[PDB]
């Protein structure tokens, strides 16, 4: 019941942590969640708001000042170049958040599919990878297992020989 | 057996609109602009705003009998002016470049 | 006698995002002008509950 | 800089506690809450990046405990419901690091709410 | 994770699971939030007069040394979690 879902679609059981393997096996079922590229992440969205929100400071000014019946060309100047202004800016902020909104869902949609590629290729070829997301271990190995296979430390000539 | 991979998916119920796609839904979101005010005047730093209510700033230079001033001022950070103002000038006249008058009392100490 | 750090003639505004719709007039220290309706970013992932 | 708070919140057996910033404009934070009980050693309750929006709650305080932020007015909350009597305690607003989320050490705390 | 106080000053806080160097001590005055005095187990800190220190890795930390109250001591490398309250 534990489907694989970076193409389906997400869990709902994680809490912390964005990206996360599901650790099953036997008698040790519960999700969690990978330590390093969830702050990498984080980091980089935190960058990209940053710098989208704290690039601007504004001063002591607005629109508005009178006229009597005789400046009717000031007031002509002063409305066609608030006007200018009052475009630009909203054109500018659409086109800014509209652009941004793609780029960073493609980030997001390509972070997991780097980690499963490196997780693919850490396991050689123990692994019976069913496609539908996840693989399915040949020879058994207990939680210490998992940890070595989160961390990085899996190797194939000492598990070489039960796999065959 | 299986080390499955997947992502973190709630029912946060949001709406975002990219350049591809329009009307997508997002766990989370940061919206960059807002639409709300307190509805009344506050003070803006300063010490506080003058109040010149059935009045203008036309007839407070020159002292109208029925503003009655505002009984008295000392400092201000920005000028309140009601949008129709009676009281004026009483006698009929025309105040010779006015107009410049309002910029040069925008702002003062 | 509030406190607040810029106004507008409809009230005074207590945000401090980079944007604004309500009005053009101001006094103080306030974001720009925009006429869009409503606008967002999005900091999260595609949300399909499967 | 500090974190000023709402103030006594005094009720009869939802609660609503408020932090806010001062000082110091939102930016990369990581607020976190801390419940220091009557007699026992201070506990954990949660942890927010409010410029994000990414929540985590400790292993105990799940089914209660829901932290929201708000970018706007610069604050961070609590929606504590069913309370108990057994969590009459101070609630403290202690800020942290958002470039090490997995491992937060608390600099500045605020100076204290009741709530019972 | 559980951890345990010590009841020319030497405080200790036993760690009953593997820490390596993920502490940070902890020392208030009755009536005011703490304030953060060393992080690290090795790496002084801001405010600090130099009066005290720590020593020690993966094993309980010596805390070698106005500075009368309550002293706690902080573990961060699996979520949080506080220690019992000095008795000084």
């Known amino acids: 019941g534990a489907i694989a879902g970076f193409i389906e679609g997400g869990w709902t059981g994680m809490v912390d942590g964005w990206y996360g393997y599901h650790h099953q096996n036997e008698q040790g079922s519960g999700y969690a969640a990978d330590q390093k590229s969830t702050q990498n992440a984080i980091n980089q969205i935190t960058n990209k708001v940053n710098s989208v929100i704290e690039k601007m400071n504004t001063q002591f000014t607005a629109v508005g000042k009178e006229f009597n019946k005789l400046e009717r060309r000031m007031e002509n100047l002063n409305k066609k170049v608030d006007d200018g202004f009052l475009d630009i800016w909203t054109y500018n902020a659409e086109l800014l958040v509209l652009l941004e909104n793609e780029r960073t869902l493609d980030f997001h949609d390509s972070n997991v599919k780097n980690l499963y590629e490196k997780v693919k290729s850490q396991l050689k070829n123990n692994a019976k990878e069913i496609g539908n997301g996840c693989f399915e271990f040949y020879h058994k190995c207990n939680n210490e297992c998992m940890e070595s296979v989160k961390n990085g430390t899996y190797d194939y000539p000492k598990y070489s020989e039960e796999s065959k | 057996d299986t080390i499955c991979i997947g992502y973190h998916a709630n029912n946060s119920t949001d709406t975002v609109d990219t350049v591809l796609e329009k009307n997508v839904t997002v766990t989370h979101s940061v919206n960059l602009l807002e639409d709300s005010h307190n509805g009344k005047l506050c003070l803006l730093k300063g010490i506080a705003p003058l109040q010149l209510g059935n009045c203008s700033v036309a007839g407070w230079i020159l002292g109208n009998p029925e503003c009655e001033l505002l009984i008295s001022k000392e400092s201000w950070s920005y000028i309140v002016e009601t949008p129709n103002p009676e009281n004026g000038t009483c006698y009929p006249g025309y105040f010779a470049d006015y107009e410049e008058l309002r910029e040069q009392l925008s702002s003062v100490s | 006698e509030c406190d607040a750090k810029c106004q507008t003639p409809q009230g005074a505004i207590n945000s401090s995002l980079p944007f604004q719709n309500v009005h053009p007039v101001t006094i103080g220290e306030c974001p720009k002008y925009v006429r869009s309706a409503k606008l967002r970013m999005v900091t999260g992932l595609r949300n399909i509950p499967s | 800089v500090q974190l000023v708070q709402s103030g006594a919140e005094v009720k009869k057996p939802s609660v609503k506690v408020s932090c806010k910033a001062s000082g110091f404009t939102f930016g990369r934070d990581s607020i976190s809450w801390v419940r220091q009980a009557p007699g026992q050693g201070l506990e954990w309750m949660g942890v927010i990046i409010p410029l994000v929006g990414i929540t985590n709650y400790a292993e105990k305080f799940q089914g209660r405990v829901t932290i929201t932020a708000d970018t706007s007015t610069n604050t961070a909350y609590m929606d504590l419901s069913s309370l108990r009597s057994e969590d009459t305690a101070v609630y403290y607003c202690?800020?942290?690091?958002?470039?090490?989320?997995?491992?937060?050490?608390?600099?500045?705390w605020g100076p204290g709410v009741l709530v019972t | 994770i559980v951890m345990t106080q010590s009841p020319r000053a030497t405080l200790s806080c036993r760690a009953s699971?593997?820490?390596?160097?993920?502490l940070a001590w902890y020392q208030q005055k009755p009536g005011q939030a703490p304030r953060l005095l060393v992080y690290?187990?090795?790496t002084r800190a801001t405010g600090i007069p130099d009066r005290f220190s720590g020593s020690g890795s993966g094993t309980e930390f010596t805390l070698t040394i106005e500075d009368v109250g309550v002293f706690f001591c902080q573990q961060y490398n699996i979520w949080v979690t506080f220690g019992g309250g000095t008795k000084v």
């Open positions: 202690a800020r942290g690091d958002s470039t090490s989320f997995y491992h937060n050490w608390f600099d500045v």
């Open positions: 699971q593997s820490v390596s160097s993920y």
């Open positions: 690290g187990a090795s």
